[PDB]
Structures are given as C-alpha cells and as structure tokens.
C-alpha cells in the first residue's frame, strides 16, 4: 500500500508540467480551460503593458489560478499514473537472471549454459534445482515440490507445486527450494500476463472504456452549452450598459465547465486499474473490469473451486444393533493404517465424536494393511476376524467369499447414502457388518459466507458439478447457491453460457484448467487463476494471481466503484454550478446592473473577491477530491433504488451545499488576508 | 383567490386525465400495427388508391419520408403565400406577401412553430388561412406524432431494423385522431360563439356613428386544429384573446384541454405500448409537478401584479393590463403557462405586458426545451432525451451500464442525445446574440431597459423551441428578423427530428432485457424526482446568465 509518498509525488509533479503543451487537447474540458488560461494570461500581459486599461492585478490573479487549476488536474492524472507505475515496477523485476540451463534431456544427467531468457524461447525444457529461479512461465511435467511465488503473487505462506494433473503451472519470477524440477518454456516471455500488464500500464497509451467515452460526450455537451451560455453574454450586456470584461467571462466559463470530473476521469480510470493490480488481478483492459461491474451470473466449478478435497466423513449412520461408539472404535481400528485424506477425516471426526485419542498401538497385536487399489480395500488384522474397508461392491464380494450375506439394514443405509449424495464406505468385522459411514464431498473453504455476500449483492451464483443431481443439490444446499448443475460436459457448459448470453445478461466465470478455454474465450469475464494452465490464462480475459475463487466479488466491487466514482463526481460538478451563479452573476454585473446586486445570498465582500473566491474554490476542489477519486467511493451492497438514494443524498446535496461553504470560507480568508 | 386558482388547476388536470386516458388507449392502438375499430375496409382501399403499403421501412426512409413531406409542404405553402393575389377567396383584395414575410410564415407553419409577425385581419386572404395554413397546422402536428410513433415503436420493438410506415402513420393520425376531434372542437366553438363563414368584411355603423370593419372568416375550423395540434397562431392578430376566436371561458377551458390532450394521451399511449402503465405515469408525474409549480408561481406573480397601480390611483394591484376581462388573472396565468409549456404559442393575455417574475417562468419553460407536456409528440421525445440522460447518470450512480426499458444506452445514442439536447440552446444563444449585435435587430424594441432584451430572448427562444408565443412588442416584420427566425425555427425543428430518428434507428436494433431484480426502477418517486431535477438543472444551468439580464434584472429593478 502507498499512502501518497513524498518520494513519488514530487517525481510526478515534475512530469506534470510536461502534460501542458499538447497532452491537453486529448481532454477537451482541460484544453478549453488551458486555452482560457492562455487567453487571460495574454490579456493580463497586454493590460499591464498599457494597451488595455483596468485592474491588471485581478486579471493576473485569475490567470494564475486558472493555470493552477490546469496543473491540479494534470497533478491528479500524474498521481494516478505514478501510483500505477510504482505498482507495476514493484511487481516487475523481483529478480532478472539469464541463467538458462540449456540442455536436451529431461533427466538429471543434462548440461547447462548461460543463454538469456530472451533467446531461450518456444517450448524448451529447463531443469531447475533447489534455490534457483524459474526463468519463465510453463508447466511442470516432472518434479513436484514447494515453490515460492511470494515475489509475484504477494503471499507469505509457502505453496506446494504438484507436478502433473492439477498444478501443472509455473510462473516467471518464482523460487524453488525443495527439490529439482523441469520447466517448459511454453509461451514466449514478453507475451505473458505480467508483460502484457506492464505493456498497458507503462509505455503504451491505454484505451478509453465506452463508459468513459459516453461520459466524455456528456461533458463535451455540457461544456458546449456552458461556452454558449458564458460567451454571447458580452452582447447581452453591451446593450445593458458597459460591456463585461473578458477576464470575468473566462473565469465564469472555467467555473461553469465541469473541471472536477473532466480533469479526474483519467485519474479514476488509472486508479481503478491500479486497484485491479493491487488486488492480484491482471486485466488487459478497463472495459473488462467495467463489464465485470455489470454481470448478474457467476459460473464456478466444484472440483477445486469449492470442494477443496475429496469425499470426506461428515456423518455416521448406525442402523440396527450397533452402537455408534463401538462403530467408531471399529472404524478407527480399520482406518488406523490409512494415509488418505478421507482416512484422516474419518480419524478426526471419530475422535471429535467419541474422544478416541489414546490408542495402545503396541498391545494391538495387529498387522497394518495399507490401501491397495487392486482389491480396492484396506483395514487391519486387529482380531481373529479381519476388518476391511473399501468400495461397497468389493466389500460385498469379499463378504460373500468369506461366507456372509448382505444385510437389509446395511443395504438401506447405503441406499440412503447414495440418494443423499455421499460415497458409501462400509466397516465389516468378520462375518458381521457393523455400519456404513457417509462421506459427502466437503467444501471446507469458507465459501458460504461469500455466496451470502453475493446474494446480498444480487448475483446468480450458478454452481456446476459433474456427478448426479442428488449429490449436486445436497452440496448446493450447504454451499448456499441458488442454481446447481450436474453431469458437466463442455458442450453443456457452453450451451448454458450461450443460454445466459442470449437471454440478455452478461456472464462471468472463473475457469482455471485448459478444458474450458473456449468457455473463457466466449466468456465476458474470464477470471483465470495463477494455478491454472498457461493456455487458459492466455485465452481468458483476466488472470487471478491469488488463485482465489472469491476474487470476482472484489473485481465486481472495484468495477462498480469506478463507475460510481465517475457518476458521483459528474453530479458533484453539475450540481456544483449553482453556487458559481450565486457568487459570480451578482458580481459580474454589479457595475452594469446594480438591481441584481441583491442576488449574492452569501453576502460576499467585493465583486472581485467573489470571482476570485469562485475560481479558487474551483481550483481547490480538484485537490480536495483527489483522495476520493483515487480510493473510490464507499461501496455498500444495497438495493438498486437505495444506492441511488445514498449517492444522490451525499453527492448531489454536496454539490448544492458544499460550494456555498467553500466560496464563503475562501472569501473570508481573502478578506482577513487584506487582499480585497 | 389562491383557493380559486388551486381548484382551477386541480379541475383542469382532473378533466385532462379523464379525457386523455381513452385517447391514450386509441393512440397506443395506433402505435401498434393494429388499426382502429370499424375502419379496416376503408383503410385497405385508401392505401391501395394512394399506393402506400408493404413498406416497413427503417429510420432512414422514415425520416426521409417525413422530411420530404415537410419540404413539399414548405414549397406549396411558400408559393401559395407568395402568389395569394391570383388565388381565389379575395374579399379584401389583399396582395401577395413579400419574400421575407412569406418565407418566415411558411417555415413557421411547416415547422410547427406558428410564429406570426403579421396581422391576419389585413395580411392574409381567406384561401390562404383556409387551405395552406390549416393544412400545415394539420401536417406539422401529424409529422410530430409520426416521429414520436417511430420512437415509441423503436422502444417497443425487439431486434428488427424496421420502424414502420410514415405515410400510413400520417394518414391514420390525420384522418382518425386530428380531424374527428377537430370537428367536435370547431362545432363547440360555433355553438358557443366563434364564427365560420366566407362573407366579406361586414361594415358596422356603431352607436357613436364611427365606421367599423369586422373581419369575418373561417375562424373556428382553423382554431380547432390550432389548439388540438398544439399549433398556435391565430386567424387574427390576437391569437386567442379575440372574442371572435375564443369567446367564452368554456371555450378557453376546452382550448386548454385541447392543448394538453395529445401530449398526455401520448404519455398514456407510451405507458400502454411499453407494457406497464407506470412508465407513462412516471412521465406524467414528471411533467405535471413542474407544470403545477410553474403555474403557481405565475399565478402568484400576476396576482401581485403592478405595484405602481395603487400609487397611480386604482383600487386593485392585479396586473390586468394586456389581459382580457372575460378571463381572470388566474385564467390568463394558467393559459400562459399551458400554451408556453406545451409549445402551443397562442395567447389569451399579451405576454409582453406581464410582471417580470410572471413572464420569466413561461420564457424559462421555453428555455429548458419544451418538455413539460410539450409539443404534439415533439415534446415527448424532447422529454425522452432528458429521460435517456437521467437513466445514463443513474446507471453511473448504481455502477451498472445505462439502461432504459431493457434496452442499453451506449455512445451511439449518447452522441445523438447530446446533439439533440444542445441544438436548441445553441440556436437560442446565438440568435439572441446576433439580434442584439445587429442594429436592425436592436431597433425592434418596444420597452426600454432589460425588458427589450427580454423581448428579444423570448422571441428567439420561441422560434428555436417551436413555440410561437411572442412578447408581441417586438416589431419582427423586418427582413433580418424574418430570415433569422426562419433559420431558427427550421434548424430547431429538423435538427431535433433527425437525431431523435437516429436514436430510434439505433435503439430498434438492440434487444430488450428483463428486470432481473437488480436493475434501477424507472417507475417511482425517486426517478420522478431525479428526472425533474435533471430537467430543471439542465434548463437552469445554460440560461440563468441569460435570464438574469432580462426578467430577473427587471424584477429586481
């Protein structure tokens, strides 16, 4: 976090003055203010040189404060740009090393060289060992150890990279410290998400969002009507008496023109992009974020997106003649030798339910049996009768071979487990079956609260599974989604996306693997994860460095924040002008129309003081609204008819009332300073 | 008399809503492709005879049809008025008009502005005001209703690029909305005291023996469409103060109801066509609140009236100068607000002889753009531009993309909305500057001080905003005034019809979207207040410096 540091604010204040000559006319509001500044400066020069009469000091002060208005708008823009560049240079270049490990054989018998990574390109195997930098992005086809992606992601806790299948992804700018791995080069360094981010932040000019274009069109219309209302007022007063001076006209024009949002649209956009960058999300365009700030439907998986684990013990169901304590004791005896996470879940749930903590392992007189998938069963030889746990069909076959039959109560509770949506695991003590343990797939990710937050926001959290509908509905009720999907095929996924898109709403999804890369391509908001594949990251829209499925909530929050900020600043600058009428209109025409002198309801000192106070307030409101533009407005999940009430009651009422206080206080300071 | 004024406003709005709901249903039926009941057999043979069928044309050809009809009407009316000497029905042997006056009144009567710088007693013959002026009062109104029909069809149509048929729309409107109500209004005017004849000017030997010439003519047939189509512009010089043209307070009340009949019926038709009537009641509340405070302020200002009257020696302070005696101060104030908010332009009280505060509010109502029951369909789209602006700023408020009735608002409609908004303040603020720099426009004053500039601003704003009501002291019969006001009327009509039609052509392509329980409720007191605030703020941020040197300076003098 950067709390506006003096190391960078001055370094961008020197670059503020570079934005004066020809970097202004891309912003029409600030270019009209710049042209007015130059015109009044020329008038003040010719007016102090004796060519034109009057109070040249007042015109010089007006010219100076208009120039300071332009410098303040450029200062807000340069502050946003400098903060974004500081974030980009903090992310970029944690370590730049040209150590290649150029070789040909993926095994641990290969050679090395010192080729730069700019030359090492297009799918080259890179063997990296512990304590060495991973050069570029790619996948880990062999290896699997604890990588250190803190310098890129921003985390602190170590992450374990699992080679093959799930975590077949690596980045450029990370550290490996446990064992030796191999890295594929895959896509070229320079076309990665980090390089695209620094390309659009530093150097190349970012493109305007269509919402920013529409707001700019509205601001151009407002400055056109204000120009036509402020000019063509010299002919209105020429008949009325003495003509009004051009300096007062330009001061009134700059006061009327929406400078507050006109000089801060770029600051708002760059601050939104920097808040993306500080939330571990890389967006290649602001249009993606502002489209994410509109979506009503969320599409997220459940294999690692919600259910962070396999099917694990949640409940115990004893049917007839077997107590739960003895059932849990026999299950603990059977699952003492089971290093699977489901076995650990069974152990911790049994100890939670019956305080089965201390076991005399030495006096067991048993032989530990590991989990063997050939017989798909596991257990221990605790007694003369042997206890084994595995799949229900293999258990039934082994019981029938031993000389026992399938029991009715055991079968009906297995069927109840099947309809409730759990994997049935049965404990069998010799020829007598004790009970069946229900193992539902466990969420244990804390996503119910975030889904409640989404329902408070009003986003259709559609959830998709690959198994049957009963299991999907059973886990959907606990997870807290409104919609559940079953039997996930990619054709069905893309059909659902097309159904949602053709209905009218905008879609959003968070896919990580390469299987839903066409879904990410035909998805408006494609939040690819850091742990996801490089192909999915390069085919999607956004890259999530933190690999958190709940990051789209923050993405929608910031995307709504930037539109809310620009709309609120727009209504502030539009409602802001009634005070400039009540301060300047009785003051501009005091020497020509003394009848309308009674309009200054703030009771200002002099007409010169009133015009100067209005111009000074217009200059200072930009600086006083820089922090709100940089941080964004306060987002609260409210009704669509209540957030408008809150935004109006704050910002429109501020536009009516705050400039009265500002102009009166600035005029009071000018009076007590002896200037007027 | 505050209770009497409030009760008059209440009964006017009540009778207006009662008489506008079934006309709203009929106009919604006409907006949809279904015809009116009991008229299909004549409809098919009439369209077979006229060759107007199987033309579901887009915004380009619809706008080209409307523009071509109005240009053809402009040429016919201009040549008829230029050569009215050879044409029949010349009882007074009135000569042909000059080029400047003829062009000014031709553009005036084809752009639905109806500015009249002449006197109809002694300037135009009977055939002129009966066969060119009446037909353009019908045709400009039908063009406005056809354009708003195209816009409402664009809002209610899903994905096709075809709006409708302009010739069919004009024919149904003119033959089954304008004319069959125009007969009832004209026959009521005859039944109450207005005249309709073709006699020569009757000479009167009065009681004192002084000779007096009475101008006869087809007055009520013109007056019916002049009020119903929000047209304005009288047969005589006094547009609706004339006892031959508005004889009784009953006729005046019928005139007010006719002025607001079609805008209110079009809001009701918009609510019925879009599916939910709350989206029309939103617009009606938004216009009616502004109308109620405007007429209250004007009524109070005219009740206060001239402060010099008691000092001069009278008994009452009410500004009854330039107001008829058959109509009260309250009735004259209500008619002024009605004819100036609706852009009708016919007056029962001379607006130039008003108090400064009571004459600012009609002038300001024209300044904001004729959106408070404005126009005849030409004020519904004027309000719809501010509605699109309000839904844009409210979408930016909520953080969503802008939306109105499901359809999305982006830069394509935003450019056109901005242009259509700023066409008329541009025309007002350059015409009021060009008239006040040229000596030939500065010498057309009648009152000294700021009221002369107020007269010029009122005249150029009524020209640019298609109102036609005048501060009548401005001697605007000069060639410069005629040409400048003709340019203002022409551009302020056909530089608002064109971008509204381009908005309609852009909006008809994109598909509507359901409510989805998270969108901004367009119907409601919050949005009514936001829309009213948007209209008043936009109209009073570009014109307070202009109004401060006129009516505000005169009032504070």
């Amino acid at each position: 976090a950067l709390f506006e540091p003096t190391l960078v604010v001055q370094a961008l204040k020197e670059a503020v003055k570079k934005l004066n000559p020809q970097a202004q006319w891309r912003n029409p509001v600030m270019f009209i203010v710049w042209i007015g500044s130059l015109l009044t400066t020329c008038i003040s020069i010719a007016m102090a040189s004796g060519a034109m009469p009057g109070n040249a000091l007042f015109s010089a002060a007006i010219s100076g404060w208009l120039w300071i208005t332009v410098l303040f708008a450029n200062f807000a823009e340069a502050l946003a740009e400098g903060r974004s560049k500081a974030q980009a240079n903090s992310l970029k270049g944690v370590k730049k090393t040209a150590f290649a490990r150029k070789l040909r054989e993926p095994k641990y018998g290969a050679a090395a060289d010192k080729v730069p990574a700019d030359q090492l390109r297009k799918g080259d195997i890179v063997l990296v060992e512990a304590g060495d930098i991973i050069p570029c992005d790619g996948e880990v086809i062999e290896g699997g150890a604890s990588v250190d992606e803190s310098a890129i992601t921003g985390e602190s806790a170590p992450v374990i990279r699992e080679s093959g299948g799930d975590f077949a992804s690596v980045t450029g700018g990370t550290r490996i410290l446990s064992d030796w791995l191999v890295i594929e080069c895959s896509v070229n360094p320079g076309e990665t998400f980090l390089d695209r981010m620094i390309a659009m932040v530093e150097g190349a000019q970012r493109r305007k969002t269509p919402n920013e274009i529409a707001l700019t069109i509205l601001l151009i219309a407002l400055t056109i009507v204000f120009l036509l209302a402020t000019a063509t007022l010299w002919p209105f007063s020429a008949w009325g008496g003495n003509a009004v001076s051009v300096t007062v006209l330009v001061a009134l024009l700059v006061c009327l023109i929406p400078t507050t949002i006109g000089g801060l649209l770029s600051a708002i956009g760059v601050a939104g992009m920097s808040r993306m960058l500080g939330a571990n999300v890389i967006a290649t365009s602001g249009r993606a974020v502002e489209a994410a700030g509109d979506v009503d439907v969320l599409l997220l998986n459940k294999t690692g997106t919600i259910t962070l684990g396999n099917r694990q013990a949640s409940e115990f169901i004893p049917a007839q003649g077997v107590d739960e304590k003895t059932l849990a004791d026999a299950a603990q005896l059977a699952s003492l030798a089971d290093e699977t996470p489901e076995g650990r879940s069974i152990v911790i749930l049994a100890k939670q339910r019956f305080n089965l903590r201390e076991r005399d392992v030495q006096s067991l007189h048993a032989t530990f049996v590991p989990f063997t998938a050939q017989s798909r069963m596991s257990g221990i030889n605790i007694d003369n009768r042997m206890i084994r746990k595995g799949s229900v069909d293999a258990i039934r076959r082994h019981v029938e071979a031993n000389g026992g039959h399938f029991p009715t109560d055991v079968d009906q509770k297995v069927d109840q487990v099947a309809r409730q949506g759990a994997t049935p695991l049965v404990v069998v003590e010799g020829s007598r079956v004790l009970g069946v343990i229900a193992l539902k797939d466990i969420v244990k990710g804390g996503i119910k609260e975030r889904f409640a937050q989404l329902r408070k926001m009003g986003i259709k959290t559609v959830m998709i599974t690959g198994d049957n509908r009963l299991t999907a509905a059973a886990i959907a009720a606990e997870a807290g989604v409104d919609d559940f999907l079953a039997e996930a095929t990619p054709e069905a996924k893309l059909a659902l996306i097309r159904q949602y898109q053709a209905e009218g709403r905008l879609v959003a999804m968070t896919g990580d693997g390469t299987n839903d890369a066409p879904a990410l391509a035909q998805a408006d908001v494609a939040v690819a994860m850091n742990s996801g594949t490089q192909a999915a990251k390069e085919a999607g829209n956004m890259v999530d460095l933190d690999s958190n499925p709940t990051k789209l909530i923050e993405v929608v929050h910031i995307g709504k924040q930037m539109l809310m900020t620009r709309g609120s600043l727009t209504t502030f600058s539009i409602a802001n002008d009634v005070a400039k009428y009540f301060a300047i209109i009785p003051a501009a025409f005091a020497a020509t129309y003394p009848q309308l002198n009674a309009l200054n309801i703030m009771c200002l000192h002099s007409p010169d003081s009133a015009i100067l106070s209005a111009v000074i307030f217009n200059a200072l409101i930009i600086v006083f609204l820089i922090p709100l533009a940089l941080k964004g407005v306060s987002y609260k999940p409210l009704t669509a008819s209540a957030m408008l009430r809150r935004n109006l009651w704050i910002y429109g009422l501020g536009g009516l009332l705050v400039p009265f206080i500002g102009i009166k206080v600035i005029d009071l300071l000018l009076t007590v300073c002896g200037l007027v | 008399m505050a209770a009497q004024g409030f009760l008059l406003i209440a009964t006017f709005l009540l009778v207006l809503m009662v008489l506008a709901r079934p006309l709203g249903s009929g106009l919604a039926r006409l907006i949809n492709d279904i015809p009116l009941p009991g008229t299909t057999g004549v409809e098919r043979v009439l369209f077979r005879a006229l060759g107007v069928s199987d033309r579901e044309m887009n915004w380009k050809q619809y706008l080209c049809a409307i523009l071509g009809l109005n240009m053809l009407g402009l040429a016919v009316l201009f040549f008829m008025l230029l050569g009215q000497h050879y044409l029949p029905l010349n009882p007074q042997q009135l000569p042909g008009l000059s080029w400047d006056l003829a062009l000014n009144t031709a553009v005036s009567f084809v752009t639905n502005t109806n500015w009249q710088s002449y006197s109809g007693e002694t300037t135009l013959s009977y055939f002129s005001q009966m066969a060119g002026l009446t037909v353009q009062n019908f045709l400009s109104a039908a063009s406005g209703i056809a354009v708003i029909f195209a816009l409402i069809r664009a809002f209610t149509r899903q994905s096709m690029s075809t709006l409708g048929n302009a010739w069919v729309d004009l024919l149904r409107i003119t033959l089954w909305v304008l004319v069959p109500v125009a007969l009832l209004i004209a026959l009521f005017f005859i039944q109450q005291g207005a005249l309709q004849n073709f006699l020569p000017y009757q000479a009167v030997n009065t009681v004192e023996g002084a000779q007096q010439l009475l101008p006869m003519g087809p007055v009520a047939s013109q007056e019916a469409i002049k009020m119903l189509g929000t047209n304005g512009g009288g047969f005589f010089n006094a547009n609706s103060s004339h006892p031959f043209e508005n004889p009784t307070a009953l006729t005046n009340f019928v005139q007010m109801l006719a002025i607001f009949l079609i805008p209110t019926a079009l809001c009701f038709a918009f609510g019925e066509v879009m599916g939910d009537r709350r989206q029309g009641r939103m617009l009606l509340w938004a216009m009616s609140v502004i109308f109620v405070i405007c007429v209250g302020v004007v009524m109070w200002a005219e009740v206060q009236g001239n402060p010099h009257l008691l000092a001069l020696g009278t008994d009452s302070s009410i500004n009854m100068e330039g107001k008829e005696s058959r109509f009260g101060v309250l009735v004259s104030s209500l008619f002024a607000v009605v004819t100036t908010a609706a852009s009708c332009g016919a007056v029962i009280a001379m607006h130039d002889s008003f108090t400064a505060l009571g004459g600012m509010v009609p002038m300001w109502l024209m300044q904001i753009g004729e959106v408070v029951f404005g126009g005849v369909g030409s004020g519904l789209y004027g309000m719809m531009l501010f509605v699109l602006l309000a839904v844009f700023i409210a979408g930016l408020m909520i953080g969503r993309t802008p939306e109105y009735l499901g359809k999305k608002i982006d830069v394509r409609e935003m450019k056109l909305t901005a242009l259509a908004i700023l066409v008329t303040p541009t025309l007002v603020l350059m015409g009021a500057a060009l008239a006040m720099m040229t000596d030939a426009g500065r010498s057309a004053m009648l009152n000294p001080g700021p009221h002369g500039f107020s007269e010029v601003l009122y005249a150029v704003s009524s020209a640019a905003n298609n109102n036609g009501s005048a501060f009548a002291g401005l001697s605007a019969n000069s060639p410069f005034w005629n040409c400048l006001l003709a340019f203002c009327m022409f551009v302020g009509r056909f530089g608002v019809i064109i971008p509204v039609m381009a908005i309609a052509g852009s909006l008809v392509s994109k598909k509507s979207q359901a409510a989805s329980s998270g969108t901004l409720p367009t119907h409601g007191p919050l949005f009514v207040g936001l829309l009213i605030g948007t209209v008043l703020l936009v109209g009073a941020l570009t014109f307070i410096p202009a109004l401060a040197l006129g009516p505000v300076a005169e009032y504070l003098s």
Partner: peptide
Amino acid sequence: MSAGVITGVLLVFLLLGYLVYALINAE
C-alpha cells in the same frame, strides 16, 4: 475596424467547432 469582437466571435466559433468535433470523434 471591429477589433475586440471580430476576434472574439471567431475564437468562439473555433472553440465550438473543436468541441463539436470532439463530440463527434472518439479520440
């Protein structure tokens, strides 16, 4: 001969043309 308004009107029309060109364009 009319300095002080003959340049003011030209500058106002120039600024209006620039601003309406900015409204037309998507710079």
